[PDB]
Amino acid sequence: DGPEKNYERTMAILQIEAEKAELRLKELEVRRLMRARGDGPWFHYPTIDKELIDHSPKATPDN
């Protein structure tokens, strides 16, 4: 292979690896915020579903 092919093939390799490296750093930062704040799709732990509640009038009024 001529030097130009190897040289520009290297640049293509470096671009992919640097792009992956940035995403690996971003993912660790996003995970840290999501776990600490609970405001994202991840670390979303269940709470009781509110559709289970019965809202019809009850045998007694104070409820």
Added chain:
Amino acid sequence: GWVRPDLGDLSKVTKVKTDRPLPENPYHSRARPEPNPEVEGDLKPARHGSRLFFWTM
């Protein structure tokens, strides 16, 4: 002139005309927490695959 109600009558659900306003927050509920921001968009393939260590897919 009192006529005894028939079997079944007093267990009917009836309607009442009331001047009283309808309560708005009878439970005294606080404002509910805002829901989590909603993820949306078009699902695209993961950039460069799993990105797990050395794997290229």
